[PDB]
Design an enzyme around this catalytic site. Structure first.
Site, PDB file in Angstrom:
ATOM      1  CE  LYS C 159      -3.510   1.850   3.100  1.00  0.00           C
ATOM      2  NZ  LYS C 159      -4.958   1.779   3.432  1.00  0.00           N
ATOM      3  CD  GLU C 185      -0.170   8.981   9.627  1.00  0.00           C
ATOM      4  OE1 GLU C 185      -0.551   9.477   8.550  1.00  0.00           O
ATOM      5  OE2 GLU C 185       0.225   7.803   9.730  1.00  0.00           O
ATOM      6  NE  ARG C 186      -2.678   2.529  13.921  1.00  0.00           N
ATOM      7  CZ  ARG C 186      -3.306   2.286  12.778  1.00  0.00           C
ATOM      8  NH1 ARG C 186      -2.833   2.715  11.622  1.00  0.00           N
ATOM      9  NH2 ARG C 186      -4.442   1.599  12.798  1.00  0.00           N
TER      10      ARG C 186
END
Ligand SMILES: Nc1ncnc2c1ncn2[C@@H]1O[C@H](COP(=O)(O)OP(=O)(O)OP(=O)(O)O)[C@@H](O)[C@H]1O
Ligand SMILES: Nc1ncnc2c1ncn2[C@@H]1O[C@H](COP(=O)(O)OP(=O)(O)O)[C@@H](O)[C@H]1O
Ligand SMILES: Nc1ncnc2c1ncn2[C@@H]1O[C@H](COP(=O)(O)OP(=O)(O)O)[C@@H](O)[C@H]1O
Ligand SMILES: [Mg+2]
Ligand SMILES: [Mg+2]
Lengths: 495, 90, 464, 467
Positions: C159, C185-186
């Site tokens: 991805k 977002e991590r």
């Protein structure tokens, strides 16, 4: 000393509303008579809503409340190793004072997106299923999620116990300091966990932050942050930390209780609009720091209890989104004897192979596909003759690998032992072994190798690779031991 | 109990589908070389088990749609009760 | 004229202003937390006018340490983000602050993040196809210029490499630029993406806007609009094509739900915010083609409980023009990009849009691959021998077709030394027409792995 | 310095006191109902300080007949109950009044029913099996002496019958004190238990505390605390082994949920009070052994609507050392005790404590039953004949095992007419080891239904023409 004071205007089920204290800060610690502690959560024009952290029955209308001028903070230092404390850092093990190196505010921000580096070091749990299928690296957040009595605490405790050899090395780059946060657990359950850790010599390097079920909801809400602060002190000093949150469902319940009692708007499942923030703020403090900041790390193992295995429930959904990977435990697998009951088909580690040593990366390469093919073929177990040769071999290999991933409780394995065991599985050396014997075979082989062929383990551990010479020596040792091994049905396991 | 019953039915249908697909493949193999043979008594086993596997797939699909409707409806009803209590206490 | 904090309830802050100085809705206000450990400048966003000169605001940062009565300054505008070519190659938060270089871009032109979509008459009335140069996408799931592409697939399916590939192709083929919007977002993954894009040397082509997971819901709600505002500047003022990546759009919806709950609004069905559709529409209608330039968006979409009828995916898919599913199965075969040709779909794979020949060739490929998927179980369990001769011919042809859907990607040059290919659409159509007709079944299977058009196919066939 | 009733809404009463005389939280107050038919003295428990010298209280008795503005007196203390050896052999209500001999225990030492749990450093995990003689319990859910045991189940699956069975097998020969807390259950059941204990001569060692389901929510909230206070006195003061039986602890939680919104609390999920886990934690953590001081507690936990995911039983599960989970599915098959062997659990079922043989046999039984559960839907649709030979063998074995886990109980004779039986643990282990090996596969499955040990099995088999 000319203190700013307010008055309790009302009190009920662990919440006190206090008029005055105009200069009180949000989340500021407050002192009520009798040494009672509260936290200012709701500030409005009329009063301050405060969560009482204990002895709420002492609170009364008209009592004088003092501000401390300080947000929640906890003592931190090396002296907390081996101790059981409450979410305020106070010892509850009856073993005297804890010498604090310094103090940390509970809400200090997480390391920034430029203060980190990629997770690249294994955090070995000693559990073959995890260390092969969903490896955990230092700085990762790996959720342990499952129904009750599926073995979640067992996996976390096995991980902590597995850190003992690393501790004994004495090298802070290999050492892992452990924090176990018990939230809402029965006190004797925490005592049992501590007994298990003591037996394996883990309390040398483990701290327990306990918020048992009889503690105030504020303590249950705060305990993960206290454990995180204790761990963060070590993380920012170049140390590596493993923190277990057993379990975050109880903390979310406590926070919801507080929020509802504070009349904050409820949403789905009656949780407040910031429960996701609660857990994400907690779990983003688990990080792998850059070399500029000392390269320390904290690895988070939050535990989530599902009900009827509904991982689409609100809190499981949140925590799954937050974490880097998930170990899904299932009671159906547990009853089938698959222990630890990890569903390898749905469990994932997004860090993946970066968290494995090269030898494990190699021997464990084919495991995932082998297990998936086995699951597809399991329907054809009784028609194995009708199966073509390749599918029959796949079925048998998958059965043996499933037996291989089984592990007794309280017995984590060193990474070299795990590599050799998985090598047995994936190199076809269990093919001649009956399925029902695999486990025993493996154990015996590992014993044999440790008794007379330790050089294989030494090579794996020192080089983190399985050399060609080491592999050939291991193969010859396996075949000799196979000559020696007696299958439970009497058939030779040779050739 | 509606959602629990629907999930039990989904599990049952999935197991039936797995068994019938295995039987269809076994019948395919046996063709080259009991009463689950469709209208044979009234090759045939292969066609009957292919039909049964397709029927179990359709049943699983319909049951999953019903289960998701029930899941959403339960979330909505729970929120309705929670917010009704909160409003009455407003 | 400055206000003062009156109530603090987590991220919700009530602020009182003098009679005639009440800030407009969505205005950004500034407050100070002066407690040393938690010292910071809070950005509040005006959400409601409560009357009697009170406004209710959502704090963009945690309010721990905030004090009743502290001064609140009105900025006179909504949240505004820096715009221009300078934002490329840099990481920003949802408020416009630079994270990799604090203070950077403070002097740039600043655009409000709340903007209308193009006026109805300014819209293009006819769909267009975004020729990517990737065989699988161009043939089976053509992307719409100005449209939205859902992206699916767990970790380890390529991805990130696909995202890098699209950044590459928009930069080098369309002369455009990229904006990545990490919604929820991590932090670990934001850092990883930053470093990886720098290593790929595509960071210069892309602006990163992160609303991190550990932030209050307000910033996670507004980060998508901030990234969209930067993309809108690139499209409308610099006259460039823009590719806007959103990961994850569901987290934008869920942050909206959290904010709605925090503000006391009654939840709608399944607990979502009552204005779920309106919020999604306001976001998605700004991603269009206008005045000859377009923003094309690829959006990661999370589906709760795998329930596509769930309100969040149901609202999101009202706006999606294509779907790209990345499959671990395809990845495991070395077929990159690992696009699942059967699960992926496009709403413009119609004769009226892509032409009759394209449609026919694509449908033939789909039919062959579907028959192959059907025969897969027999192959696996009973062996390929059991299959009829026509079935064996179909299996060989389908294996070649599925390997020919693989391509050597621009972003793959950094792992495999070889550079990438850009296959013109006509070349792909004719190549796959011949493949379906069976004009290459004699050539070895490996000849079809990771090549471009027919010249590469001939070259690799001879090299074998 | 007395208060006055300001508002009355069902079981919740607002009381205004003079400034400086607001009663402390949990204090007991007294108010008079003078209407002749309903005349009584209400005991109110202070729940909240509402501010402005107003307190919200929970009535212990029905408030019918109560009038606004009547005098409220502060006793200055919490509800307190009599403690000591004198409570043995007598029946009390949640307020400490003796029902069988009114006025008895007035002069005893009295203890407040609100108390902190034992300190953590005083807690010692308990790992010692409490053999019952019930096959399913001793094999799959072994009970712990001095530990916490719960019977979970929906309505009418046999929790009370099993509670009485455990009073029969454990309390009859107990060398210590027993405390039975009837929490919000049927008055007829309380009278039956009282008579049965008197008949067994176990009453002399047993203190009974009843708050029935027909009492107002306050009594159902506090009766468990009263019984637990008596038990705590026996644990910490007399220093003898204590047996504590509670039926049904869920009622406590339910009672708390009945007054939650009247107390002004926004409801939580599934209609429960927001304070569910915290109040349960206080109470449950008081129910524990401490180092050297043993309380073996056995709690019946009602599972609403058979839904084991319901927040009340879900929150209760964390407090137990052993859980016997009763199932409607098992009940409806006629299997008694209606134990779900797959869902039940015990913390001492591991090789170290119970031994390798017991653990192995139990694990094999669980594996077979789990496989049978997996195969049930297939057998329902496609029939047994489409199983593999090994699966057919396993199904036959599993049917016999599931039937042999059932047992004729002493407390069940009132229902079956069959006298009960007791099976030693060693015999249970040997019998199930033989069963899992298929040594009894040739006997009809009906031979295994509602019997004791292997001799009962042989006799029933011969009665059925087998051997
Ligand atoms: N690998 C294992 N092999 C055998 N038994 C195990 C294993 N892991 C755990 N168990 C047993 O399974 C039971 C459940 O374990 P554990 O208490 O760790 O689970 P849990 O999911 O944390 O439970 P709870 O709901 O009580 O928190 C315990 O008896 C434990 O001994
Ligand atoms: N086209 C390709 N050529 C070579 N390697 C690839 C290709 N696509 C993916 N990979 C490899 O597979 C791994 C996973 O790809 P990536 O996009 O990073 O997955 P994710 O984004 O899910 O983390 C990467 O480490 C990369 O090296
Ligand atoms: N061991 C048993 N044998 C036969 N019948 C039983 C047994 N246990 C319960 N029953 C039947 O089921 C009913 C429910 O029992 P009880 O324990 O009162 O239900 P609950 O689980 O609600 O307490 C009993 O009244 C009896 O008729
Ligand atoms: Mg646990
Ligand atoms: Mg009962």
């Amino acid at each position: 000393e000319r203190e700013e004071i307010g008055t309790v205007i009302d009190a009920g089920d662990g919440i006190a509303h206090v008029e005055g204290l105009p200069s009180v800060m949000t989340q500021e610690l407050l002192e009520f008579p009798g040494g009672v502690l509260g936290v200012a959560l709701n500030l409005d024009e009329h009063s301050v809503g405060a969560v009482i952290l204990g002895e709420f029955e002492k609170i009364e209308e008209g009592q004088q409340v003092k501000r401390t001028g300080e947000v929640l903070s906890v003592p931190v230092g090396d002296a907390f190793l081996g101790r059981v404390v409450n979410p305020l850092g106070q010892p509850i093990d009856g073993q005297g004072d804890i010498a604090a190196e310094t103090r940390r505010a509970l809400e200090l921000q997480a390391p920034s997106v430029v203060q980190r580096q990629s997770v690249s070091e294994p955090l070995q749990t000693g559990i073959k299923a995890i260390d092969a299928m969903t490896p955990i690296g230092r700085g990762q957040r790996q959720l342990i999620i499952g129904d009750r009595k599926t073995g979640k605490t067992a996996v976390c405790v096995d991980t902590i116990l597995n850190q003992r050899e690393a501790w004994l090395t004495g090298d802070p780059k290999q050492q892992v300091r452990c924090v176990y946060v018990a939230i809402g657990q029965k006190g004797t359950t925490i005592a049992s966990v501590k007994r298990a850790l003591e037996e394996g010599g883990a309390m040398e390097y483990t701290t327990i932050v306990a918020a048992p079920a009889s503690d105030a909801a504020g303590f249950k809400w705060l305990a993960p942050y206290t454990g995180s602060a204790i761990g963060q002190h070590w993380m920012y000093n170049g140390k590596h930390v493993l923190i277990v949150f057993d379990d975050l469902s109880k903390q979310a319940d406590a926070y919801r209780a507080i929020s509802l009692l504070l009349r904050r708007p409820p949403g789905r499942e009656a949780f407040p609009g910031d429960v996701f923030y609660l857990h994400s703020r907690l779990l983003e403090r688990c990080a792998k720091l850059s070399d500029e900041l000392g390269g320390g790390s904290m690895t988070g193992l939050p535990i989530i209890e599902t009900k009827a295995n509904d991982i689409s429930a609100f809190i499981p959904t949140n925590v799954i989104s937050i974490t880097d990977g998930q170990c899904f435990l299932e009671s159906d697998l547990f009853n089938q004897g698959v222990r630890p009951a990890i569903n390898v088909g749905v469990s994932v580690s997004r860090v993946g192979g970066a968290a494995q040593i090269k030898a494990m990366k190699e021997v464990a390469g084919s495991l995932r596909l082998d297990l998936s093919q086995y699951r597809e073929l399991e329907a054809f177990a009784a028609f194995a003759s009708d199966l073509d040769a390749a599918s029959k071999a796949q079925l048998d290999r998958g059965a043996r690998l499933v037996e291989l991933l089984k592990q007794p409780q309280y017995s984590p394995l060193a990474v070299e032992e795990q590599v050799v065991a998985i090598f047995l599985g994936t190199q076809g050396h269990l093919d001649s072994v009956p399925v029902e014997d695999v486990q025993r075979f493996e154990s015996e082989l590992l014993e044999h190798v440790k008794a007379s062929h330790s050089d294989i383990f030494d090579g794996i551990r020192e080089t983190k690779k399985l050399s060609e010479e080491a592999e050939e020596k291991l193969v010859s040792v396996i075949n000799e031991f196979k000559k020696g091994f007696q299958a439970s049905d009497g058939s030779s396991v040779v050739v | 109990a509606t959602l629990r019953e629907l999930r039990g039915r989904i599990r049952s249908a999935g197991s039936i589908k797995k068994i019938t697909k295995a039987q269809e493949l076994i019948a395919t193999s046996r063709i080259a070389k009991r009463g689950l043979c469709g209208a044979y008594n009234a090759a045939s086993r292969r066609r009957a088990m292919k039909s049964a596997t397709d029927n179990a797939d359709d049943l699983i699909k319909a049951l999953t749609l019903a289960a998701n409707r029930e899941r959403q409806a339960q979330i909505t009803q729970e929120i309705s009760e929670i917010v009704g209590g909160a409003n009455a206490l407003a | 004229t400055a206000g003062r904090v009156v109530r603090i309830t987590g991220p919700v802050v009530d602020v009182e202003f003098p009679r005639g100085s009440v800030p407009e809705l969505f205005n950004a206000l500034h407050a100070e937390i002066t407690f040393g450990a938690l010292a910071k400048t809070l950005t509040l966003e005006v959400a409601q006018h409560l009357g009697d000169s009170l406004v209710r605001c959502i704090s963009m940062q945690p309010t721990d340490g905030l004090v009743r009565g502290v001064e609140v300054t009105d900025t006179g505008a909504s949240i505004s983000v820096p715009v221009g070519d300078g934002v490329k190659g840099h990481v920003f938060n949802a408020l416009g602050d630079c994270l990799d270089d604090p203070g950077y871009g403070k002097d740039f032109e600043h655009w409000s993040i709340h903007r209308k979509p193009p006026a109805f008459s300014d819209l293009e009335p006819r769909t267009e196809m975004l020729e990517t140069g990737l065989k699988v996408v161009d043939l089976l799931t053509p992307y719409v210029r100005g449209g939205k592409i859902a992206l699916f697939g767990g970790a380890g399916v390529g991805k990130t490499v696909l995202i890098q590939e699209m950044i590459n192709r928009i930069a080098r083929n369309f002369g455009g630029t990229s904006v990545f919007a990490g919604v929820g977002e991590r932090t670990r993954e934001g850092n990883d993406l930053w470093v990886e894009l720098a290593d790929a040397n595509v960071l210069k082509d892309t602006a990163l806007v992160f609303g991190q997971m550990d932030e209050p819901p307000g910033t996670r709600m507004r980060v998508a609009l901030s990234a969209l505002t930067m993309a809108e500047f690139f499209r409308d003022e610099q006259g460039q094509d823009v590719l806007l990546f959103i990961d994850n759009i569901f987290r934008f919806t869920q942050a909206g739900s959290e904010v709605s709950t925090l503000l006391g609004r009654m939840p709608s069905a399944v607990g979502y915010q009552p204005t779920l559709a309106d919020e999604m529409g306001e976001l998605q209608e700004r991603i269009t083609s206008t005045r000859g330039r377009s923003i094309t968006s690829m959006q990661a979409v999370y589906v709760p409980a795998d329930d596509y009828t769930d309100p969040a995916p149901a609202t999101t898919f009202a706006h999606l023009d294509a779907t790209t599913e990345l499959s671990r199965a395809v990845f495991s075969k070395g077929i990159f990009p690992a696009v699942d040709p059967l699960a992926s779909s496009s709403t413009i794979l119609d004769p009226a849009i892509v032409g009759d020949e394209h449609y026919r060739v694509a449908q033939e490929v789909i039919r062959i691959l579907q028959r192959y998927k059907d025969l897969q179980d027999i192959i696996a369990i009973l062996g390929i021998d059991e299959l009829s001769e026509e079935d064996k011919q179909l299996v060989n042809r389908a294996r070649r077709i599925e390997r020919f859907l693989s391509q050597n990607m621009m972003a793959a040059e950094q792992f495999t030394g070889q550079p990438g290919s850009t296959v013109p659409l006509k070349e792909t159509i004719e190549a796959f027409d011949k493949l379906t007709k069976g004009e290459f079944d004699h050539l070895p299977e490996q000849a079809f792995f990771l090549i471009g058009g027919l010249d590469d196919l001939a070259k690799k066939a001879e090299s074998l």
